[PDB]
Structures are given as structure tokens and as C-alpha cells.
Design a protein around this ligand. Structure first.
Ligand SMILES: N[C@@H](Cc1cc(Cl)c([N+](=O)[O-])cc1CCC(=O)O)C(=O)O
Ligand SMILES: N[C@@H](Cc1cc(Cl)c([N+](=O)[O-])cc1CCC(=O)O)C(=O)O
Ligand SMILES: [Cl-]
Lengths: 254, 255
């Protein structure tokens, strides 16, 4: 009856706690998602064991059909819940049962300060500034699948030259923005996070799409609806808003 | 394939009587954002449907005895297969019906006249000269009624005083009350956008007080809920929902 929770290291949602001594079990971790999981477990009355997804991926398909990451963990019933910044997409929703979103966001642009660039359109209609995304997350998958003129055009640039405009993780993307003439396409809530800790960076433009993070469960899970209900309540009570502010504060930038 | 019964409610610009010089029949009677959404869903999922106005003309709330009414009750009692309307996904409602994921996201905000120094809910809550309220026994009102958040608790107490006279019968009345008197209406943000496109002396004050969505309602256990959620997710990603909103919201301009 103790639930297995699959998740992934991603600041500030899930991080190894800083410690002078070895930590064990759930105490090894901290972050927004750990806080959310505590609230959920209290409300619904379950125990849980947090387990990092072994392959270190969120979840995508390969050339012919097979899934990986936390999405596959759910499909195989190697996990009961996935509590991470896991984007609710229709392709994923076809293979797992997502709760309703605990956070809403969209793709936006991370870039250095001091430029005239103001929108995705600006990037798309030029080639002097490089731009790209982290591989195999919902962000790359968005551009790859898009039939929307500008984003289709952006994908062609991004996917060209054996995908040299893409990066392996957000941290590398961030360093690339800091060091070179490069703009990173990134989920807005992570842009918010980073820009309040590094005053040299800023968001460019608004959100190019709209979507949410949801708790994942296997198709047919009896916990999904209960989790949705708890989330809706936590949102209404202002507790999700408080949780976000707790983890996003950072040092602060103008 | 059995034709689905879709309960809904007249609410501009989601669901409206179409303008015709001759009598209209069946689904052709109505138009609006929700009709377009419904047409997309039926094409994608391959179902036929009959649109039926909710007889009691209510969204869905509980009386003193916990009893539901409105489209919520229609779903619980299996008198409709789907509810396609600007129906707010709340935890209280989600307990008794099965909501699809939201086809539109929004929050409570403030509708008020341009030109005032008022900038937030907090500004309203700490004073008593400017009247403020919500649609009586509506979902926005219910948020305040139930809130344990200090500022919103304070607003509800003010709102609820004088046998709920700061509450208005409906949105239309609230709008006219904003236009005629010194009154601010707590209203769902997507409706504020609609109104301010057409009433150039009015504006939204401050940001969203909360965060929520409108979803398609289905009875608990419905086979259609997850299929619809999947269809909505896809329409959203494809940008079709945004186009649909643009279509119905765009006004003639404020020069
Ligand atoms: N939400 C993504 C996973 C993800 C989450 C976060 Cl929180 C960040 N990030 O902190 O910049 C990055 C990514 C992966 C790049 C992406 O797709 O945005 C998914 O569901 O695949
Ligand atoms: N979303 C509300 C129904 C509703 C929808 C709209 Cl679209 C408007 N409106 O145009 O101002 C009003 C209302 C009811 C007043 C309210 O709850 O604010 C519910 O789910 O009960
Ligand atoms: Cl759902």
C-alpha cells in the first residue's frame, strides 16, 4: 500500500538535499515537488517511496513506438505516481492518466539582456542568432510537431546540421546563452526561476503556447482522480501559489 | 451510434441564440465558442449530438441540504452525456462529476471603470466606499464564501453583508451596475476580456486572484471524458482553441 513515486532531478522541483551526513529514503530529496507530494500524501493518506527514474528521462517515444523515462515507468507499473515537472501533452495523455495540472506555463525564450530581440518571430526571421532547445522534452517535441508557420520554420533551423542548436539539459542551455549569441527556448516557469537568480538573463516575449504540469499515473489508476481533487483544492486554498513563491524567490533581480 | 445529449446554458459568447428572420430548429438554433468546440469534438471523436438548454438555467451549486442543481445535476442524474459550457472546474464539483481537462484557463479578477486609483483586490478589501461583489450564489461568489485567505475572507464578509446586496442577479446586471454606479464586479477574467473589448470605459483591475479552467463535464465513469481530454489537448497544441477564442472575442476596437 506504500506508493512508489518516480521523479527526476530538476531544480527547484527535485534536488538532492545539501547535507553534512549521508541521507536516506525520502529525506535525500527536497524541492517544490517534494512539498507537493507531502501535501498530497497527507490529504489522501498514503505513504510513499521516492525513486529517481533510472534512465534519467521525462518520457518520449523512439522511431517506432517505445516509451522511456518516467512515462515508461508508469506504463510498466514500476511506479504508481510520477511527481515531476512533467508536461501534459496529448501524445503522453494517450498512454498514461494525468491528473489535472498543478502548474500552468508555456514555452518562452531565455536570452541575455540588452538586445532588441522581442519575440519568437524576430528569431525565426534571421540566422545570425542561434536558438534551440533541450532534446526530447516537451519543448523540442512541440517545435518538431508544429504546423504553425513560425514554429515549423524554427524547427527546421533547430533540427538542421545534425541538431547542433540543441542542448542536452537546461544547465548547458543556460551556459550557452551566457557565453554565446544563443537564445534558449524554455518553459516559462524555469525562465522565471533562472532570471531571478541570474540578473544577466531575461525572458524574451510572452508564452508561445499554453500547457500544464500534471502528476502521472498508469492508465486506469484509482489514484488519479483523488490526486486531481486534492490538487484542485490545494490550488483554491492558495497553497500551490505559496509553494511556488517559496521555491522561486531566489536572490531577486530587477 | 446513439446521439449524445449535450446540456448547456445561454452565455455570451459561449452559447447564444443565432440571429434569423425565420424560426430555427435543433442545433442550428445556437452559435458561439462552445458550439464550435462541440463541432470540433464531434468531428474528432465521431459522435452525433443534440444540444439541450439546462431546464433550470443554472450552472451547478448545492443548496442548504447539499443537493445539486443545474448542469451538474443533469450529469449526476444521467440526463445528459456531456456539459459543454463555461463551467468552472472546482474540487467540489469534480467530486461529483468527471471533468475533462480545461479547454480554457482563467481566474477571478476585477471589472471596474477606467480612471480610478484602484489597482488590486487588496485596495478594494481595505475600504468600504466603493461597493464590490459578484454574481449572487455564483461560482465566483462561492470562491469568496469558502476562502480562508485573509483578504478574500475580508471581502466576503463585506460582500455578504446586508442580505448579500453587493451581489448581483447575473453578469449583465453586474455590468450595468459597474457602468451606472461606483461598483466593482468580481468576474472571471475571460469574461472581463470579452466585456472590455465592447465597453471602452471599463477595464480589468489587477491580475488573476486565482487560477482555474473551464472543462467539459461528464457523468462519473463516462467513457467520453478521457477521449475528450485528449481531443482538447490536441486542439490546444495545434493552436485551434486560441483561434476559436480570437474569433468570438475580437471586438470592433477601442479608439
Ligand atoms: N516539462 C518537460 C521536462 C522539463 C522540465 C523542466 Cl522544469 C525543464 N526545465 O527546468 O528547463 C526542462 C524540461 C525539458 C526541456 C523542455 O521540454 O522544456 C517535459 O515534460 O518533457
Ligand atoms: N464559470 C461559472 C459560470 C459563469 C460563466 C461565465 Cl462565462 C460568466 N460570465 O460570462 O461572467 C459567469 C458565470 C457565473 C458567475 C461567476 O461564477 O463568476 C461557473 O462555472 O459556475
Ligand atoms: Cl482529468
Amino acid at each position: 500500500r506504500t506508493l512508489i513515486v518516480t521523479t527526476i532531478l530538476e531544480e527547484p522541483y527535485v534536488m538532492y538535499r545539501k547535507s553534512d551526513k549521508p541521507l536516506y529514503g525520502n529525506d535525500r530529496f527536497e524541492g517544490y515537488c517534494l512539498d507537493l507530494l507531502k501535501e498530497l500524501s497527507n490529504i489522501l493518506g498514503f505513504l510513499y517511496d521516492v525513486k529517481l527514474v533510472p534512465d534519467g528521462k521525462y518520457g518520449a517515444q523512439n522511431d517506432k513506438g517505445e516509451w522511456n523515462g518516467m512515462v515508461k515507468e508508469l506504463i510498466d507499473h514500476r511506479a504508481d505516481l510520477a511527481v515531476a515537472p512533467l508536461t501534459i501533452t496529448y501524445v503522453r495523455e494517450k498512454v498514461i492518466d494525468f491528473s489535472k495540472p498543478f502548474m500552468t506555463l508555456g514555452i518562452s525564450i531565455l536570452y541575455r539582456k540588452g538586445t532588441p530581440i522581442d519575440s519568437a518571430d524576430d528569431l525565426a526571421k534571421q540566422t545570425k542568432i542561434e536558438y534551440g532547445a533541450v532534446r526530447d522534452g516537451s519543448t523540442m517535441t512541440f517545435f518538431k510537431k508544429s504546423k504553425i508557420s513560425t514554429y515549423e520554420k524554427m524547427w527546421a533551423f533547430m533540427s538542421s546540421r545534425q541538431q547542433s542548436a540543441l542542448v542536452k539539459n537546461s544547465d548547458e542551455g543556460i551556459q550557452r546563452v551566457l557565453t554565446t549569441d544563443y537564445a534558449l527556448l524554455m518553459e516559462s516557469t524555469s525562465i522565471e526561476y533562472v532570471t531571478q537568480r541570474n540578473c544577466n538573463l531575461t525572458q524574451i516575449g510572452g508564452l508561445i503556447d499554453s500547457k500544464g504540469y500534471g502528476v502521472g499515473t498508469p492508465i486506469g489508476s484509482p489514484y488519479r482522480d483523488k490526486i486531481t481533487i486534492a490538487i484542485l483544492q490545494l490550488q483554491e486554498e492558495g497553497k500551490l501559489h505559496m509553494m511556488k513563491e517559496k521555491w522561486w524567490r531566489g536572490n531577486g533581480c530587477p
